[PDB]
Amino acid sequence: SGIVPTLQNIVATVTLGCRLDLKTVALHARNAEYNPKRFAAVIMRIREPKTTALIFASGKMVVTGAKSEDDSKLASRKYARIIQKIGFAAKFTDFKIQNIVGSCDVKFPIRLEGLAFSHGTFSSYEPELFPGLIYRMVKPKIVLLIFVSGKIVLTGAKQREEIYQAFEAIYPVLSEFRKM
DNA sequence: AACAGTAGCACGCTGTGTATATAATAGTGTGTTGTACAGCACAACTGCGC
């Protein structure tokens, strides 16, 4: 082994606590998009940490694109400050990470059909529909996308340890189904 | 007759469908409920006439 998964995307939610006028928000923000007809939220962005926020009239906000939990909270506080600077009585509350995505490379090809047959109740593999095997782990409850190349995607985690836990648990199985 | 330029065709590369999680919230679609409108031979009935 020796491989440890790399975090790729962190999704979080934040309650600003006050109602927002989206045209005002979009108008005053330096990096905003807002087309009511397409989606009901201002799509705001900041350069550091590089992230994207979906800002709603209710004052709720979704922050995505961060590569670390630190970066997620940091960028979230920053978006909240922007809203304040524009003039609303916003508050940075209820910061919570909802989804963590990770990925790695085991460095060997995998026999997906064998794995799907062996771990049938957790696996779903339809190569004509999507080339990767969808593995639904029980403990921890994580979803893994397994590819012939040996590249692995882990998602559905609320905490970093779950990403790490799942990979540790899957590695022996990937080894059992290697090609070379 | 030869050379240069322009147009057309073919090939290669980049971008967007499929799948995973996860939050946000008002809309859109579907289903259900309510209201309104549109071959014998003999056996029995029944029908007609006295």
Account of the 3D structure:
The protein has 180 residues and is of the alpha+beta class. 27% of the residues lie in helices and 33% in strands. A hairpin with a 4-residue loop joins strand 3 (42-46) and strand 4. The longest helix has 18 residues, at 69-86. The relative contact order is 0.18. The protein binds one DNA strand of 50 nucleotides through strand 1, strand 5, strand 6, strand 9 and strand 10. One of its GO terms (biological process) is positive regulation of transcription by RNA polymerase II. Sequence repeats lie at residues 7-83, 97-174. It comes from Saccharomyces cerevisiae (strain ATCC 204508 / S288c). Its main location: nucleus.
Task: Note the overall shape.
Answer: elongated
Total beta strands? 10
Give the neighbour order of strands across the main sheet: 2-3-4-5-1-6-10-9-8-7
**What distance lies between the first and last C-alpha atoms, to the nearest angstrom?**
15 Å
Q: Give a short account of the largest sheet.
A: 10 strands, antiparallel
User: Could you state the oligomeric state of the chains shown?
Assistant: part of a larger assembly
Taken in chain order, the helices and strands follow as EHEEEEHEHEEEEH
Number of helices: 4
What is the percent of helical residues?
Answer: 25-40%
Which radius of gyration do the C-alpha atoms yield? 20 Å
Structural class: alpha+beta
Percentage beta strand: 25-35%
PDB class: transcription
Keywords: transcription, transcription initiation, RNA polymerase II, general transcription factors
Entry title: Architecture of the RNA polymerase II-Mediator core transcription initiation complex
Name: tata-box-binding protein
